[model samples]
Target chain A: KSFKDRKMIEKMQEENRKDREKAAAKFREYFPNFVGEPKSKDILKLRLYEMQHGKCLYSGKEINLGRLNEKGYVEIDHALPFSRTWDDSFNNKVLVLGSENQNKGNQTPYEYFNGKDNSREWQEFKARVETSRFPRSKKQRILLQKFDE
Target chain B: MAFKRAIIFTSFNGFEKVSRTEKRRLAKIINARVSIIDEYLRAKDTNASLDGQYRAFLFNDESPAMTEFLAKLKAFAESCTGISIDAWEIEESEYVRLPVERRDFLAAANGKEIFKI
Candidate 1:
C-alpha cells in the first residue's frame, strides 16, 4: 500500500473506532431496552433493524422478525458474500428479506445487483447506511470500502 | 478442522425481569457483555409468552476473547433464572451462509428445554 493508501486506511480505522463508540453511546440512550446490565451493550440485530425500519438492506422489503414463514422474515446476510470475503463481522452483515437473501445468493452487494435500477437502489441504500449512526467495526468498514470498488 | 472465529449467543426471557444493574454485573462476571437487542425480537415475535419462554439475545465477539467471554457467561448463568447461554464456533469457509431458518434454529433456540443450562 502506498503511504497515502496506508494513511487513508488508518484514518478510516480511527474513525470506525470512534464512530462505533459514538454509535454505541447513542444507542444506549435511544433504545429503551438498549441498556440494562452495568456496562452498555451493542444489540447488533436490533440496531440494524431500527436503523432500516425493519426493511431489507437491499430490496427494502418489510421484515417480519417474529414470523420466519412464507409471509416474510429477516435474514442476516453478508454485504460481501462469505464465500468471497470470508468475513462474518457485524459490518459485513445486513438484514434482507428471505426472497432477497435467496436471490442474492453468494454475490457481493454490487455484484448481485449491478443493473441500472439495482445500481441506483444500491447507491441510495449505501448512502443511508453510511450516514446512519449504526456501528460498523474496523474489519467491517474496510470490507465495505473494498465492496465499493 | 480449524476454526478462525466464534459467535456466542445467549437466550433469556423477560428483559424486564433482569434489572439493568444486574445485567451489567452478570456481563462483568462473564468477562463479556450481553446484547442490547436482536434475537430478542426474533424469539419475542415468534411467541406471545412473557414468562421467560420466548426471548433469545445474541452477542458475538472474536476469540480467544470469545473463549473467556463464553466461560464467564456460562459461569454467570448459574445464578440467574430463565437464562441459558451457548457458544459456537464459526468454521472458516469460502461460501455464503445466510442466517436462514434452519441455520438460525440449529444455532439458537431449537429444541424445547433439551439443554437448559
Candidate 2:
C-alpha cells in the first residue's frame, strides 16, 4: 500500500475509536407521575419536541415514548446526520426514534435528494409531512412514496 | 463501510472536501435542525432530575430560513472538522419559569410545564 494509504487507514481507525464512545450518554428529566424520562436533559429535551412538531420529523410520527434513563432511550438525530463531520452547535440535533435514527445514522438525505434533482421530492415530502396529522399514525404515503421514487 | 479521507495539513486537518451532493444531503439534515430541537423540546417536558413533569413548550422552532442558515453552518463545520455533528443544545429563556398561583386558582391555573416524558 502507498504511504498515503497507510496514513489514511490510521486516521480512519482513530475516528472509529472515538465514535465507539457511542455518543455522549445524555440524560433528561421527566414529569413526576407519568413514569418516564426524557431522552435528553431538560435543555435539550425542549428543543427536540418543539422543533420536531412533537413528532418524529423523519417519520412524521408521535412517540409512544416513555421515560428513558441516562442511556439514550430516544435516538436523538442531528438534522444534519452526524456523518457530515459538521458542528454540533445547538441547532443541529433532532429528536427521533432509536430505530429510525439507526437507519438514518450518518446518512445525508438532503444532499442526495438535491443531487438527484429531486429537491421537489423532499419538498413535497416535507409538505406532506406537515399537512399530515400527528400522533403520526399514517405513513405519510405521499412523502414515503416520493422517497421511493 | 463508509470511505472517508483523512486530510492533513501542516498543523491540523483544517480543510475537508465533500461532494456537492454530500454537502446537500448534510445540508438537509443540518438545516433541518430537527434532532437538537427534539432533544430540547423533550427536555423541556421533563424535569432534569427525573422528577416532576413540566407542562410547557421547549422551543419556538427555527423558521425555514433559519433551517437553511443552520445547514450552511454545518457545511462550514464539516470543512473545518473531520467529524460531523451528532447533537447540540441551544438556549432560550422562558420569561417565567413557572406561573404564579392565582388567588382564584382557576381551572387554567395549572402551572405551565414543559412537555415532559
Candidate 3:
C-alpha cells in the first residue's frame, strides 16, 4: 500500500476505536447493570431488543424475546450473511421476526431488498436503519450494498 | 488436525479502574500470543476514563493450555471484580482470512491493541 493509504487506514482505525469506546459508555448509561460485552446469544438478544425498542427491525412489530426459540417468533439475523462475511459481531447482527429472517436468507439487507433504491421496501428499510438507535457503524452495515471483504 | 490459534474478545465494567498489578495478573492468566486492552486508568484522553468499560483481545492457540487458561481467567475476573466478565472466542483461521479492512475494522471497533507476546 502507498504511504498515504497506510496512513488513511491508521486514521480510520483510530476513529473506529474512539467510536467503540464511546458506544460502550453510552450503553452503560442506558443500562447501568450491563456488566460487559454480551457473552451469550440471549444477552445479545436482550440488548438488541432494547436498542430496537422491542420491535422487529423489519416488521416494526413488538417482539417477545421469551418466544425466540419458538417457530415464527423472534430471531436474530446477520445483516450480512455469516457464510460470506464471517462477521458474527453485534454490529453485524439484528433482531427480526423469524419469518423475515427466513425470507432474507443468505442475502445482505440491500440484496434481500432487491437493490432498488427507490422501491418502497428498500426506502422504508433505509429509513428505519437511519433513524434507529443502532450504533452508526451498525447502521452503515445494514445499508451496505456489498462487503469489502 | 491440531488446533493452532484463536482470537478471544473480552469485556467487563470497571476494569479500567483496576490496579495495574491485577491487570498484569489477568494478562498472565490470559496467556495470549498477542493482547490488547482498550481502556486504561491513565489513558491519553481523559474521556476514556469516564467510559468505565474495558475491552481486551486475546490471541492464542486453542489447546489444553488455552482451555485451562480461559477457566482460570474467568474465575479470577469474577473473584476480583465481583461482576461477570464476558468473552467470545473466534478461530484464528476465520479471523486472518478476512480482508485487511475488515480485520482492521474489527480490531479498531473492538479496542486498541495493548501488547504482543
Candidate 4:
C-alpha cells in the first residue's frame, strides 16, 4: 500500500478506536443487550430511538434507552415479529417498551394492537411512527399497515 | 484569533455510498485528513439544504489556512465522476478549540445542532 493508503487505514482505525470508547460510555448508559458487537448495536439503538422521537411504538409512551429496567426503557422489537415473517431488517425493527414487547410476542402490531376499541389508538400510533426523522419506505409502510386491515 | 469555517458542496445522494478510500483521496488532495470527514458529517446532518447538495461547518480555528483548504477538494470533485466536492462556505469562527475532543465527544457536541452548512 502507498503512504496515503497506509495513513488512511491508520486514520480509519484510529477513528473507530475513538468511536468504540465513546460508544461504550453512551451505550452502557442504557444497559442494552446486543447479539454481536456492542458498539454497532449501540449505534442502531440510538438512531432508532431518535427517529421514533423517543416514544414506544406500541404504548406511545416516552422511551429512554438510558433507563432500561425502568418505566420507559426501549427494546428493539420487530414490528412484524420474526417468528411470523422470518424477516429481520431496518423496516422490521422498532422501539417498544419491555412489557409491551412481551405483550406483542410473535404478533404483528395489527394483531396485538387490534380490535374495535383499538381503532383510534392504532391510527394515532401509525401516524406517530411515520414522522420526518423516521420516514419509512413505501413497502415498509404497506407491510406495517397490512397487519391492521 | 479569527474563527475558522469550512464548507462542503455535494448532494446527499453524492455521499450516501461514499467509500472511505474516496474520502481519504479528497482529504489528501487538500492535505486535510480529518477535517474533511468532520466537515462532511456536520454539513450532511444540518437543517441546511439537502436540496442543493451543499453543506458546511463553522468551527473556531486559523481563518487564513482554513479558507484555502477545501479549494483543492472542490476542484477534485468537478474533475472526477463519483462523489465530487462542488463548492464551499467560508467563515471565521468565534471560538477555536485546541486539540479537538474524541470522536464520541465531538459527536455529542454535534448533537447540539449548533453547527450548520
Clashing residue pairs in candidate 3 are B36-B114
- For B2-54, candidate 4 gives per-residue lDDT tens digits of 32344444443443455556555554543232331222332222213233443
Ranking by DockQ: 2, 1, 4, 3
Q: What lDDT tens digits, residue by residue, belong to model 2 across residues A1-149?
A: 69999999999998665432322211221223323434335545544544443455565445433332224546655655445546365445556656556654454546533525667646744653444232242223212322322
DockQ of each: 0.07, 0.11, 0.02, 0.04
Ranked by lDDT from best down, the candidates are: 3, 4, 1, 2
State which candidate has the highest TM-score.
4
lDDT of 4 by residue, A54-134 (tens): 566677666543353344456777777787677677777776777667766676666566633568766766566554245
Write one digit per residue (lDDT tens) for candidate 1, span A1-149.
Answer: 59999999999999667645544643433333433522321345545665454466677555543332223456667777778778787667676676777766776665555634556766756655654435656324522533434
Q: In terms of lDDT, which candidate is stronger, 3 or 4?
A: 3
Model 3 alpha-carbon miss at residue A106, Å:
1.9
- Stretches off by above 4 angstroms in model 4 are A1-3, A28-43, A64-66, A69-73, A115-118, A138-149, B1-117
In model 2 chain B, where is the ten-residue run with the lowest total lDDT?
A: B1-10
- Steric clashes per prediction: 7, 53, 1, 5
Error of 2 at A55 (Å): 0.9
TM-score, candidate number 3:
0.40
Better of 2 and 4 by DockQ: 2
Docking class of 1: incorrect
TM-score of each model, paired residue for residue = 0.36, 0.33, 0.40, 0.46
